[PDB]
Structures are given as structure tokens and as C-alpha cells.
Design a protein around this ligand. Structure first.
Ligand SMILES: Nc1ncnc2c1ncn2[C@@H]1O[C@H](COP(=O)(O)OP(=O)(O)NP(=O)(O)O)[C@@H](O)[C@H]1O
Ligand SMILES: CC(C)C[C@H](NC(=O)[C@@H](O)[C@@H](O)[C@@H](N)CC(N)=O)[C@@H]1Cc2cccc(O)c2C(=O)O1
Ligand SMILES: [Ca+2]
Ligand SMILES: [Ca+2]
Length: 334
């Protein structure tokens, strides 16, 4: 996490309190991750599995998180399989533990999604179609969602802190910053309506869902916010192109294969006008820019490996040159 949060975190005290709030024994806790949030797995008395995610008010308010929890509950009540929030013993979706410094650690729990992450055996057109139908149902459902408290309102796409590349990258990279500013201006020219824009997951990839008996169960809604539906799609495409489970021989051909199957599924559940498909390259480029910033947080600029330096140089050059993320001509899908 943030170093201040790490400095304030008394892990034993927090897990002791969490054990009381969520009715589990300390001995049944497994540490999973600490890079972004603190994430743990546990089992309760009856043997069911749960995921405990801990953040802090320095990163996000309780009410912002409650907006995610409210939306996930709405999706679940409309027949979408998601890792559902679990109320604490006090009937709360988010539990705050004061840190004695004016802030609070924010605890929340979800059901552990059944199954596990996709494997080589799963990486095929059937998966891609299932992802399309899952995403399509999410988009069709979200159209009717209304925020119940103004404090719970999730961000608009352009409010994303990680798009503020000037915060993350060297200030002499004026061309990269020009490219980002210009692309943002172009995306702001797109029309917004209920049928094309809404609250979406915004971090879809195969690290953020399980596959169980041929069905998708998503989790990690922590970046959910208001986007064009085609950006939710584009983010998933970016991610399958970046870390494919099986290497592809030809990036353009794979893009076409993924998209053909995905869209076949998507059409089962939602109606998206073909004109949006042409915007995918622009949204892929925006994601590429966001990742470039992230790599600067990820890497120590003062002790870079040769591979890290090469990756940063590649992203920079691609952004400056406007090299498309994929060579695929999206007009082929029409
Ligand atoms: N509801 C869930 N069901 C099953 N496994 C989960 C669930 N939530 C999280 N996990 C697992 O725990 C890991 C970390 O959780 P995640 O919510 O992705 O953490 P994060 O702190 O947001 N880090 P990041 O992966 O950078 O988004 C995931 O990659 C899964 O392996
Ligand atoms: C450390 C980070 C660069 C890792 C990256 N994650 C992302 O690119 C996104 O989660 C972020 O870009 C996103 N959280 C940014 C945001 N603020 O919405 C990667 C993306 C990814 C793609 C395909 C499969 C995966 O398992 C993953 C994965 O787990 O994470
Ligand atoms: Ca994740
Ligand atoms: Ca996350």
C-alpha cells in the first residue's frame, strides 16, 4: 500500500477485530496480497470460504466503497453471478476500525467465488463467448441502476487518478503528455446516453474472475465507475492481448478471433451499435497510457533491470508514434 497506511497497520490487532466482526478464527486466515489492498482468505465455522479486503481512508472513503458494494448487490439481484458482499455481524457492508490518527482501516468481505482462474485448457472461443455474454448482461442490467446516496457515486472515467500521467512520469516527456491530452480531448467528443455509457466493472481480465462449470464469476470491482460500454470491452481486450494464457502467433488474427467470439456472446445479452467498434483502438491507446504511468510506480527508476528499462522505452515510443495496440482493422467486424 501507501507507506503511511503501512506504517499505521497493526495486522494482528486488525485481524483480531475482523475475526470478531465476521465470526472466524485467526488460525483459518491465509494472506493473499498486499500490493494494493491487504487481501486475506478465511473460512468460517461451517467451512465456507470468504475474502477479506482491507483498505484505508487515505486511499478511499467508506462511502465510495459502499457504492461498489451497492452496485454488486444490484447486479446479483438481477441474475448476474458475482462474488457477493457479506454483511458483518453488525449488518454493515464496510467496517471501519479507527487508526487513532483521524483515519480508519476499512474492512469488507465477499464470498469466495467458486472454481478458479482460467487455465490453458480453458483458453478458447467458448471462454471468449462466455465473457461476451457476461459483459453484455452487466451492461444491459446497469442501464437501470440508480445511485441511492450521493456519497456512494462512483467516478466518471476521466476522474481516474491514474490518467493524470503528469503525476507519475518524467516532466520532460512532453510528447507523451501531449498525446494523452489530445486523446482525452478526442474521447470527450463522444456522445453519452443510457444505451452507450454507464457504471461498469472497468478492470475485466482473467485475474479478476473465476471460471466454474463454464460460467464466469467476477470479483475485484474496486475500479468500477462510469464509462462507455465499449471501454469496458476495450479494457478486457487490452488485457487478453497483454497476458494471453496461450501465446498467439499473430496478434491481428487473435484480435479477430477473440472479438468474433466475444461479440457473438455480447449480442445474446445487449445491443451495441457497430459504430462503437471503430473506437476500440482509441480506448486501447488510453489504457496503454494508463499502464505506462503504472509502470513508473511499479518500477524503481533508480535500479531498473534491462527488461524494465526496455519495457518503459517501448511504451514511450509506441505512445509517441501512435503505434496501434493491435494491427487489427476493426472495420472487419462490420
Ligand atoms: N471474491 C473473490 N473470490 C475468489 N478469489 C478472490 C476474490 N477476491 C479476490 N480474490 C483473490 O485474491 C486476489 C487479490 O484480490 P484483488 O481484489 O484482485 O486484490 P487487489 O488488492 O485489488 N490487487 P489487484 O489485483 O492489483 O487489483 C485475486 O487475484 C484472487 O486470486
Ligand atoms: C500491477 C498492474 C499493472 C497489473 C495489471 N493490472 C492492471 O493493468 C489493472 O488492474 C489496472 O490498470 C487498473 N487497476 C487501473 C485502474 N485504476 O483502473 C494486470 C492486468 C492483467 C491482465 C491480464 C491478466 C491479469 O491477471 C492481469 C492482472 O492481474 O493485472
Ligand atoms: Ca485484481
Ligand atoms: Ca483491484
Amino acid at each position: 500500500m501507501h507507506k503511511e497506511v503501512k506504517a499505521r497497520y497493526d495486522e494482528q490487532m486488525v485481524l483480531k477485530k475482523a475475526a470478531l466482526l465476521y465470526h472466524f478464527q485467526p488460525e483459518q486466515v491465509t494472506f493473499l496480497a498486499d500490493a494494493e489492498n491487504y487481501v486475506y482468505e478465511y473460512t468460517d465455522e461451517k467451512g465456507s470460504s470468504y475474502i477479506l479486503k482491507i483498505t484505508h481512508t487515505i486511499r478511499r472513503s467508506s462511502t465510495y466503497i459502499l457504492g461498489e458494494m451497492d452496485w454488486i448487490r444490484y447486479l446479483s439481484q438481477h441474475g448476474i453471478s458475482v462474488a457477493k458482499p457479506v454483511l458483518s455481524a453488525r449488518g454493515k457492508d464496510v467496517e471501519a476500525i479507527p487508526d487513532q490518527a483521524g483515519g480508519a482501516f476499512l474492512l469488507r468481505v465477499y464470498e469466495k467465488a467458486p472454481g478458479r482462474k482460467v487455465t490453458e485448457a480453458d483458453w478458447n472461443g467458448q471462454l471468449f463467448q462466455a465473457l461476451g455474454a457476461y459483459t453484455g448482461r452487466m451492461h444491459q442490467t446497469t442501464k437501470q441502476y440508480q445511485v441511492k446516496d450521493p456519497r456512494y457515486k462512483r467516478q466518471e472515467w476521466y476522474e481516474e487518478e491514474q490518467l493524470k500521467l503528469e503525476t507519475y512520469i518524467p516532466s520532460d516527456q512532453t510528447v507523451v503528455l501531449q498525446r494523452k491530452d489530445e486523446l482525452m480531448q478526442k474521447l470527450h467528443q463522444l456522445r453519452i446516453s443510457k444505451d452507450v455509457y454507464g457504471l461498469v466493472h472497468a478492470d475485466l481480465h482473467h485475474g479478476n474472475f473465476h471460471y466454474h462449470q463454464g460460467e464466469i464469476i467476477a470479483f475485484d470491482f474496486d475500479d468500477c465507475g462510469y464509462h462507455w460500454f465499449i471501454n469496458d470491452i476495450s479494457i478486457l481486450l487490452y488485457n487478453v492481448l497483454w497476458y494471453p494464457v496461450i501465446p498467439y502467433e499473430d496478434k491481428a488474427e487473435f484480435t479477430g478471433e477473440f472479438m468474433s467470439h466475444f461479440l457473438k456472446g455480447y449480442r445474446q445479452e445487449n445491443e451495441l451499435d457497430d459504430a462503437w467498434l471503430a473506437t476500440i483502438p482509441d480506448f486501447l491507446m488510453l489504457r496503454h497510457m494508463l499502464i505506462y504511468g503504472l509502470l513508473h510506480q511499479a518500477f524503481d527508476l533508480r535500479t531498473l533491470s534491462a527488461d524494465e528499462s526496455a519495457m518503459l522505452a517501448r511504451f514511450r515510443k509506441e505512445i509517441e508514434d501512435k503505434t496501434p495496440i493491435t494491427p487489427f482493422d476493426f472495420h472487419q467486424l462490420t
